[PDB]
Design an enzyme around this catalytic site. Structure first.
Site, short mmCIF file in Angstrom:
data_model
loop_
_atom_site.label_atom_id
_atom_site.label_comp_id
_atom_site.label_asym_id
_atom_site.label_seq_id
_atom_site.Cartn_x
_atom_site.Cartn_y
_atom_site.Cartn_z
N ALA A 163 -2.27 -15.60 4.17
CA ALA A 163 -1.21 -14.80 4.64
C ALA A 163 -0.66 -15.22 6.31
O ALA A 163 0.40 -15.60 6.27
CB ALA A 163 -1.80 -13.24 4.60
N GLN A 168 0.76 -1.22 -0.13
CA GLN A 168 -0.04 0.01 -0.01
C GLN A 168 0.90 1.22 -0.23
O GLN A 168 0.80 2.16 -0.71
CB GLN A 168 -0.84 -0.03 1.16
CG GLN A 168 -1.51 -1.29 1.60
CD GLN A 168 -2.54 -1.15 2.82
OE1 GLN A 168 -3.71 -0.53 2.56
NE2 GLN A 168 -2.37 -1.98 3.73
N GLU A 184 1.35 -8.97 16.79
CA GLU A 184 2.43 -7.91 16.52
C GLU A 184 3.77 -8.22 16.85
O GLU A 184 4.71 -8.47 16.08
CB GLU A 184 1.79 -6.61 16.86
CG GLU A 184 2.95 -5.49 16.64
CD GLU A 184 2.24 -4.27 15.49
OE1 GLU A 184 1.99 -5.05 14.39
OE2 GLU A 184 2.38 -3.49 16.02
N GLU A 190 26.59 6.27 0.75
CA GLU A 190 26.62 7.24 1.53
C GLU A 190 26.03 7.18 2.91
O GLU A 190 26.52 7.17 3.92
CB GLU A 190 26.21 8.45 0.96
CG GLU A 190 26.73 8.85 -0.56
CD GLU A 190 27.58 10.13 -0.21
OE1 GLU A 190 26.97 11.23 0.27
OE2 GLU A 190 28.79 10.14 -0.76
N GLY A 221 3.61 -8.16 10.83
CA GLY A 221 2.70 -8.74 9.76
C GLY A 221 3.20 -10.18 9.74
O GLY A 221 3.95 -10.64 10.25
N1 LIG Z 1 1.43 3.36 7.18
C1 LIG Z 1 0.81 2.47 7.01
N2 LIG Z 1 0.93 1.39 7.71
C2 LIG Z 1 0.16 0.48 7.29
C3 LIG Z 1 -0.47 0.23 6.02
N3 LIG Z 1 -1.23 -0.91 6.03
C4 LIG Z 1 -0.91 -1.62 7.30
N4 LIG Z 1 -0.23 -0.94 8.18
C5 LIG Z 1 0.41 -1.18 9.21
O1 LIG Z 1 1.23 -2.48 9.24
C6 LIG Z 1 0.47 -3.43 10.01
C7 LIG Z 1 -0.44 -4.34 9.27
O2 LIG Z 1 0.15 -5.48 8.74
P1 LIG Z 1 -0.95 -6.39 8.02
O3 LIG Z 1 -1.70 -5.63 6.90
O4 LIG Z 1 -1.73 -7.12 9.22
O5 LIG Z 1 -0.13 -7.58 7.25
P2 LIG Z 1 0.75 -7.57 6.10
O6 LIG Z 1 2.47 -7.22 6.89
O7 LIG Z 1 0.50 -7.19 4.94
O8 LIG Z 1 1.14 -9.27 6.06
P3 LIG Z 1 0.09 -10.35 6.45
O9 LIG Z 1 0.16 -10.52 8.06
O10 LIG Z 1 0.43 -11.75 6.16
O11 LIG Z 1 -1.34 -10.11 5.80
C8 LIG Z 1 0.06 -2.79 10.99
O12 LIG Z 1 0.54 -2.27 12.03
C9 LIG Z 1 -0.71 -1.57 10.46
O13 LIG Z 1 -0.78 -0.62 11.36
C10 LIG Z 1 -0.52 1.22 5.09
O14 LIG Z 1 -0.98 1.67 4.27
N5 LIG Z 1 0.33 2.32 5.50
N1 LIG Z 2 34.44 24.91 -1.20
C1 LIG Z 2 33.81 23.71 -1.53
N2 LIG Z 2 33.71 22.89 -0.67
C2 LIG Z 2 33.02 21.86 -1.20
C3 LIG Z 2 32.27 21.76 -2.60
N3 LIG Z 2 31.65 20.43 -2.40
C4 LIG Z 2 31.79 19.67 -1.26
N4 LIG Z 2 32.75 20.64 -0.51
C5 LIG Z 2 32.95 20.26 0.72
O1 LIG Z 2 33.75 18.94 0.85
C6 LIG Z 2 33.47 17.99 1.96
C7 LIG Z 2 32.55 16.90 1.56
O2 LIG Z 2 33.35 16.14 0.73
P1 LIG Z 2 32.88 15.65 -0.78
O3 LIG Z 2 33.59 16.55 -1.66
O4 LIG Z 2 31.58 15.27 -0.85
O5 LIG Z 2 33.70 14.14 -0.99
P2 LIG Z 2 34.15 13.23 -2.20
O6 LIG Z 2 33.15 13.82 -3.21
O7 LIG Z 2 33.44 11.83 -1.60
O8 LIG Z 2 35.22 12.93 -2.57
C8 LIG Z 2 32.48 19.04 2.77
O9 LIG Z 2 33.52 19.69 3.90
C9 LIG Z 2 32.07 20.25 1.82
O10 LIG Z 2 31.87 21.77 2.56
C10 LIG Z 2 32.44 22.74 -3.07
O11 LIG Z 2 32.00 22.82 -4.32
N5 LIG Z 2 33.15 23.90 -2.85
#
Ligand SMILES: Nc1nc2c(ncn2[C@@H]2O[C@H](COP(=O)(O)OP(=O)(O)OP(=O)(O)O)[C@@H](O)[C@H]2O)c(=O)[nH]1
Ligand SMILES: Nc1nc2c(ncn2[C@@H]2O[C@H](COP(=O)(O)OP(=O)(O)O)[C@@H](O)[C@H]2O)c(=O)[nH]1
Ligand SMILES: Nc1nc2c(ncn2[C@@H]2O[C@H](COP(=O)(O)OP(=O)(O)OP(=O)(O)O)[C@@H](O)[C@H]2O)c(=O)[nH]1
Ligand SMILES: Nc1nc2c(ncn2[C@@H]2O[C@H](COP(=O)(O)OP(=O)(O)O)[C@@H](O)[C@H]2O)c(=O)[nH]1
Lengths: 429, 426, 95, 426, 429
Positions: free
Chosen positions: A89, A14, A173, A244, A133
């Site tokens: 289920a 869902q 649960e 990351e 579930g």
């Molecule tokens: N946010 C969110 N929580 C949901 C939704 N549907 C169910 N839940 C939550 O997930 C749990 C329900 O799980 P179920 O629907 O009973 O079961 P299932 O995990 O789909 O699997 P089965 O038990 O075999 O049917 C409850 O804690 C609900 O509150 C949804 O659409 N959104």
């Molecule tokens: N001046 C400056 N700093 C940068 C820029 N981009 C990322 N930084 C700095 O670089 C650090 C992050 O590293 P990053 O560049 O993402 O590493 P890498 O991309 O995995 O090699 C942080 O301290 C940022 O402020 C930039 O375009 N200019």
């Protein structure tokens, strides 16, 4: 470059249909698949004029996946990619993991091996499941299980919807969630968490509506998630790869679970009000009433946050708004961590549903993080378990499904060291 | 003479776009176009940064190293992005993980050979090679790790040609990453032992200098980068111009490094006035030294006023009196005898080009070798220990084939490096 | 404090090359479930058609006296040779 | 002087279409048309490949030998297919079975006399004959068997005129047939003892060189063929052009074969850059030797870097300095003294035409006689034994009137041929 | 140049009508014979308007050949070329080979000697029979028999439809198939095999339809076959003569039987989906669920494959897609065979029935091969035989038809050395 996704369990499906909706919506690809690399890390150009889905759908009752192949979007996925087990289920881990769930897994995998091949140097699988579930807890348990071995060399970020703190549904649960945690723990890379209840608050307090359909919570995660993959895998002024995350987000091998948070949650009808400042949204991030998780920073020291921004944002604005925060102290970050702020800047502002209830600002902050806070959430969920196990409650339902006093007791001990883990990595210097 | 720029990582890369954005205009080279040069002097020495193939296509002789496609695919899909010969792009579509270890031992180590390959194709270009320019950030994978490797290899291949390093040392107040001190301490280590001229810039020393010395209210990165690139142009390229008293990388090196560590400097530009108003033109010269030698205006984080200098190199570039230049420098050396170290009768190295920054009348790049930068490696080194002690995000390193003794090594090394630098502040 | 021993660093060389300084690879239980899986990746990294017929089918000792079948035989900072069918030519591998 | 091409088998034939597709344009000869030659020099020496009958119809003087109609009936029913005088088509409507034995002893042996007949009609054409060009594949019937016979007969009829052989030795990785080593080992045998210049090409050495040295993503056969035909044009035809220092088949032969085996070479073209972009023009000359002498770019499968050279012949064809040519060759001979054999003070045979490949500014065919090709006959020879041992598909040979001692013979012979070649690598 | 064809047995005739259909269909020759050399190796330009077939039809019951001379195509063949023996079929080898089948043979031959003359330097006769039948097993047995002597100097590729592994029809089937194998073995050049059952799977799993009429399986072989003769005898970038096959396909005199496989089998209605990559189809060829034969490469090492491609294909694409395969190892090729990959490239893409159920791609791979796999298929079919012979079961039905304890027992011993043959030529180094 890409990141497959496996939406498991009705819920995960869902939420899937939702997150999957928001997508095309901000990529100009009508439900017919056609739009008139960049985002190729989530969509394969089957030719050709279409787009299709770069994911799969796994439920043991047809009901829920069926509805997808009725309502526009029906055209979006491949008739194939939506796996079902007409069978049963069962709101019980065991059955879904062992007994039944087993039969399907092969087939399931096949797609995440057939869809994993077709691509070009992928990065991982964004998994979508609902902790407590049957198909969501159990099944995945072994799905992620069979992945960690078939592609140990990738990212396994599982996006979960863990048990409402007081408003759970299933009677069991916890059985299902203490079991999906222990089996997936030694297999995930980073597990995102979005609390179903703590999201309602946001719908009551930060949007006002006592009429929140599941279809809404989904629009929400459907948002926070869009900030993760979608836009991030999308060019920007400070790109952040999936790897990351886990790197800048997990201090320790436990498939650590950060929390998802979004900044601008304001209801349409408010839509005209003067927009919020870069400082306000930043600050809203440190409020325990806006985090899609009933893990209010009751003490949990953050230990790493990945502030993903999107829209019109000046790097100084951030490298300042964050500075101000780093010195609020009442926001106490772990000791062994000097700086734990991964600033992720994207360009394209968010993209709100045409007429749902989401404001529609020109900048947002989807900050996720690992907080010694969950020391709670896990605790409170573990305790639950015991109470019932203490009496075996619905145990006969699993045993009779290829499980044993082992798997329970031995998965309890498991989390036990997750209550100590999330305790040791913090609270101490 | 010549040099071959190196865009390690994203940052070092992002900046490449700005360093080349500038430099080109300071050499009349349009995207793929040729030399439109308003003058005729911006050509007799270009070679230092380009190559002759067509006759209108002088291609920048730099290297673009990065394990994240999207990046170079943003630099190559924008403005001047289509001037670099594709051969220059040494990408690593792998997972450019933010781990120093992931871009220095496991992932980068592979892409290296396919880099050195080119760094040789460019070196063996023609004439005589001087050294290589290196841009990057010491707070990430492709930057500190893989770029810090690129040099360790370069310095084994030509321990003759020089190695200027432009590092974006981890800004204090707020760290734009989390392991930062990990990726940093590990790269500084490699620096103190290969490159022989490092110019450390701080994203927040810039903001400041860019939000108060340029009433600029929305200092985008492009800007910071732009300001930086402004200094690295005054340094190199500049001196490869005529002058009453010109120098060149070596002079700069052979006048600025008293002791082999390599030592790191802190660049400072001259006319740094806000657009409209400020255009005071108070640039007779005492105004430039006024500028350059103040605390704020030092791209570094630390403040000179917090520690003597060993050497200084005012590389001016605009017609002026070898008298009002040579003179000023003196009073400056006497008003601040306090901090300027004594065992060097004339710390300052006055340099003087002729042609100034295209649109300006008079400028002067400042390259300071002050003992103040002690109070930065300290910082970095601190952050390490405070987190090393608990091995914080160490599993992302080791799990990538690293060593518990590797981190020890670097810290110490770079930590000792702090020590030494004090040996002169006293 | 969980139990662990990280992966294993080895220098892989392709039998009959006396030119290529082999390629370094890491090996563990989380990366490769078995030698077959490692060999699978090895084929891709060492993929060739001069020194290795099908890329990499087996891994032999620095001398080629015995081929490794289990990952448990791979020690840190080790030196291995890639084989498939060709015989050992004994070259200055580590020399 | 003159020569008479020979299209043995399908491959050798398919290629004929490409060798003549090219060559013609490199001589302004339209399908049946005459000399439209952009110049006047592409005519004074044509004779080498044509004949005068009409006055606009200079017909290619080659032979088309094949036991499979469909083939020649595809080459004769397409583009330039209607330029060969029908007399040239020596077909064998028989069953062109994929057996070396079926096209050398049983089926081909018949069609031979009706071939030699023509090979004489063409030889006794006019002026003075130089030698014959031979194209084919050593992995089939009409190719290795029947074509390998055509020569054994040719070399008995004119042990004076030369014999260049262009063989498509069985590619490693994946063979385009199953008995391959059978049809091969058997033909190489015949080669090492009749033709005196062989240029071995590998369908997969081409792909590579055609998919990475030409970003070409869909390298159809036509292409491979086209690339090959590009080299055989630089060799022959080319040298039959003027030049500061020109050579001709013999020079090439008398400078490249130290020992009578006949030895096989490995051709390499010069400007091999992808269309649009790459059109770098870096072709001053060091760029051509850069090319030609690298591993990749050797149409052979083996890599030179894996074995000394005995001789080399850079047959350049485009206005250049006998100094920047004669010079380069040297450094090349010294940077790689390692592999270039010593008992030959000047391995390299610099050759220099004038007019270049029609549309290009400067090219240079490379004909290397390296000891590296040892590691190929090894390959072939291996495949044999591994299957001979079990007499695999041997019944298709013997059952065609063959001998169990015939296969023994060839392998050994060609196997010894491997031996010898090592006698110089040391 | 040409290749006559003798469709024997109702089945070989049904399949014949099918393969014969696909033909004109991709040659623009309406059922009226008229179209508005190239393909002359299968059609003679008789009269000055028509295209009389280049084959014959042999059944002992009229029923099946009759239907051909009712339904359009009625106009296609010559009233003559469709041989019949009003008499009796009999699902028994003996009767069809000896007793009855004999009477017709002369006449039969006459056509394959009258049709073999009219042409211009032919190459052989593509024979179509159904192993386990009466007119198909027996008869042919002596037809191919009388050919190997009258034209030993040609190709004898017999295209068979050998016994469904578990879903056989006739009660005796094996009697009829252990007998058509031993008698034809010493007479064929290359025997292609297409398993009736293992083709159904393809209709269930790779096309989806539990409604597969015989008329479909026929459309299929009717396809794989078109890839053999039709298109191959048709110009291209890498032509492959019939001889070519047997040469590049049989390592040993036993009339070795390769297996037919096709790549693009996807159902219309899927017809729009983005097409499959050169790599995918290539890979599909190494899947034991797409090979028209229940001989899953359970161990059988390939020893030679003739990858016939058709449509838009770049030789490098192949001389790469195959390279990738040559190094998958789990596809283990025989030892004594370095390279066993005959790459046959044609131009004209396939040609699917206007509206059957075949996708209709712009490129396909009809790969056939000899696999040590049939060591099985023969085994499992031989064993069958014994069980019954062990009790003489329907023996009195043959004896009383001019056969003896000899022909059975002595044809059993025959195949025995076919179980050892297909074992020795492999499994050993
Ligand atoms: N946010 C969110 N929580 C949901 C939704 N549907 C169910 N839940 C939550 O997930 C749990 C329900 O799980 P179920 O629907 O009973 O079961 P299932 O995990 O789909 O699997 P089965 O038990 O075999 O049917 C409850 O804690 C609900 O509150 C949804 O659409 N959104
Ligand atoms: N001046 C400056 N700093 C940068 C820029 N981009 C990322 N930084 C700095 O670089 C650090 C992050 O590293 P990053 O560049 O993402 O590493 P890498 O991309 O995995 O090699 C942080 O301290 C940022 O402020 C930039 O375009 N200019
Ligand atoms: N693919 C395919 N298989 C067929 C077809 N018709 C029959 N078969 C198979 O071939 C065998 C049937 O042979 P029969 O029809 O009994 O006999 P026949 O070979 O025509 O000759 P007689 O026994 O004398 O009638 C069975 O194994 C059938 O499954 C067909 O149209 N297509
Ligand atoms: N370069 C190249 N190789 C070819 C061509 N045709 C067939 N080959 C190669 O020739 C071998 C097959 O022999 P073939 O030419 O069919 O033999 P023949 O026709 O019976 O004499 C395979 O190794 C093919 O890759 C071609 O047009 N160009």
């Amino acid at each position: 470059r890409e990141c497959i996704s496996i939406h498991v369990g009705q819920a995960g499906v869902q939420i899937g249909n939702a997150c999957w909706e928001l997508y095309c919506l901000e990529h100009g690809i009508q439900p017919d698949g056609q739009m008139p690399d960049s985002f190729n890390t989530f969509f394969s150009e089957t030719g050709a004029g279409k787009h299709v889905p770069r994911a799969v759908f796994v439920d043991l009752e047809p009901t829920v996946i069926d509805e997808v192949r009725t309502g526009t979007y029906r055209q979006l996925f491949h008739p194939e990619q939506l796996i079902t087990g007409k069978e049963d289920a069962a709101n019980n881990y065991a059955r879904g993991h062992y007994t039944i769930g087993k039969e399907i897994i092969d087939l399931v995998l096949d797609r995440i091996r057939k869809l994993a091949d077709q691509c070009t140097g992928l990065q991982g699988f964004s998994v979508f499941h609902s902790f407590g579930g049957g198909t969501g807890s159990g099944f995945t348990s072994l799905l992620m299980e069979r992945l960690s071995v078939d592609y140990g060399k990738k990212s396994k970020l599982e996006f979960s919807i863990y048990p409402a703190p007081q408003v759970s549904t299933a009677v069991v649960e916890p059985y299902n969630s203490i079991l999906t945690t222990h089996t997936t723990l030694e297999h995930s890379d980073c597990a995102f968490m979005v609390d179903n209840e703590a999201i309602y608050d946001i719908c009551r307090r930060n949007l006002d509506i006592e009429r929140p359909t599941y279809t809404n919570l989904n629009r929400l995660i459907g948002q926070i998630v869009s900030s993760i993959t979608a836009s991030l895998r999308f060019d920007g002024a400070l790109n952040v790869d999936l790897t990351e995350f886990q790197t800048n987000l997990v201090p320790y091998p436990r498939g650590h679970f950060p929390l998802a948070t979004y900044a601008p949650v304001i209801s349409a009808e408010k839509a005209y009000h003067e927009q919020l400042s870069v400082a306000e949204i930043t600050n809203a991030c440190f409020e325990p009433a806006n985090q899609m998780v009933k893990c209010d920073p009751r003490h949990g020291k953050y230990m790493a946050c990945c502030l993903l921004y999107r829209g019109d944002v000046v790097p100084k604005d951030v490298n300042a708004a964050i500075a101000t925060i780093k010195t609020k102290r009442t926001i106490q970050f772990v000791d062994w961590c000097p700086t734990g702020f991964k600033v992720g800047i994207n360009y394209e502002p968010p993209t709100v549903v045409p007429g749902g209830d989401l404001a529609k600002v020109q900048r947002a902050v989807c900050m996720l993080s690992n907080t010694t806070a969950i020391a709670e959430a896990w605790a409170r969920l573990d305790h639950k378990f015991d109470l019932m196990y203490a009496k075996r409650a619905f145990v006969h339902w699993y045993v009779g499904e290829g499980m044993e006093e082992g798997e329970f007791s031995e998965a309890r001990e498991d989390m036990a060291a997750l209550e100590k883990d999330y305790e040791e990595v913090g609270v101490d210097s | 003479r010549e040099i071959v720029h190196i865009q390690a990582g994203q940052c070092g890369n992002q900046i490449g776009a700005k360093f080349w954005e500038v430099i080109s205009d300071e050499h009349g080279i349009d995207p793929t176009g040729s030399y439109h040069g308003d003058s005729d002097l911006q050509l007799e020495r270009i070679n230092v940064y380009y190559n002759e193939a067509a006759g209108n296509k002088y291609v920048p002789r730099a290297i673009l190293v990065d394990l994240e496609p999207g990046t170079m695919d943003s630099v190559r899909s924008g403005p001047f992005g289509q001037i670099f010969r594709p051969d220059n792009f040494v990408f690593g579509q792998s997972g450019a993980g933010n781990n120093w270890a992931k871009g220095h031992y496991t992932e980068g180590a592979e892409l290296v050979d396919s880099v050195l390959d080119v760094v040789r194709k460019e070196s063996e270009s023609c004439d005589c090679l001087q050294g290589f320019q290196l841009t990057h950030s010491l707070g990430g994978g492709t930057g500190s790790g893989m770029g810090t490797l690129l040099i360790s290899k370069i310095r084994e291949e030509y321990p003759d040609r020089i190695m200027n390093t432009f590092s974006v040392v981890p800004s204090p107040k707020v760290s734009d990453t989390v392991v930062e001190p990990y990726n940093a301490t590990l790269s500084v280590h490699q620096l103190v032992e290969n490159t022989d001229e490092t110019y450390c810039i701080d994203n927040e020393a810039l903001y400041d200098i860019c939000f108060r010395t340029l009433k600029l209210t929305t200092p985008t990165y492009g800007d910071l980068n732009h300001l930086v690139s402004a200094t690295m142009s005054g340094v190199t390229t500049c001196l490869r111009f005529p002058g009453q008293l010109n120098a060149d990388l070596r002079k700069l090196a052979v006048n600025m490094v008293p002791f082999p560590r390599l030592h790191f400097f802190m660049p400072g530009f001259a006319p740094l006035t806000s657009r409209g108003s400020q255009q005071y033109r108070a640039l007779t010269v005492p105004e430039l030294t006024q500028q350059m030698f103040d605390a704020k205006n030092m791209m570094a984080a630390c403040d000179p006023r917090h520690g003597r200098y060993l050497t200084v190199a005012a590389v001016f570039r605009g017609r002026m009196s070898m008298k009002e230049v040579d003179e000023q420098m003196l009073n400056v050396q006497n008003k601040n005898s306090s901090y300027f170290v004594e065992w060097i009768p004339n710390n300052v190295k006055t340099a003087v080009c002729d042609i100034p920054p295209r649109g300006l009348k008079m400028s002067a790049t400042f390259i300071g070798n002050s003992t103040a930068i002690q109070e930065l490696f300290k910082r970095i080194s601190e952050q390490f220990t405070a987190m090393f002690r608990r091995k914080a995000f160490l599993h992302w390193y080791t799990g990538e084939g690293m060593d518990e003794m590797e981190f020890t090594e670097a810290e110490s090394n770079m930590n000792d490096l702090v020590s030494e630098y004090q040996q002169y502040q006293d | 404090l969980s139990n662990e021993k990280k992966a294993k660093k080895v220098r892989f060389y392709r039998n009959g090359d006396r030119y290529f300084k082999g390629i370094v690879y890491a090996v563990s239980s989380d990366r490769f479930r078995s030698f077959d899986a490692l060999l699978a990746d090895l084929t891709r990294s060492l993929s060739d058609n001069i020194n290795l017929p099908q890329g990499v089918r087996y891994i032999y000792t620095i001398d080629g006296s015995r081929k490794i079948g289990s990952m448990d035989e791979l020690e840190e900072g080790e030196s291995y040779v890639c084989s498939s069918d060709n015989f050992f030519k004994k070259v200055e591998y580590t020399k």
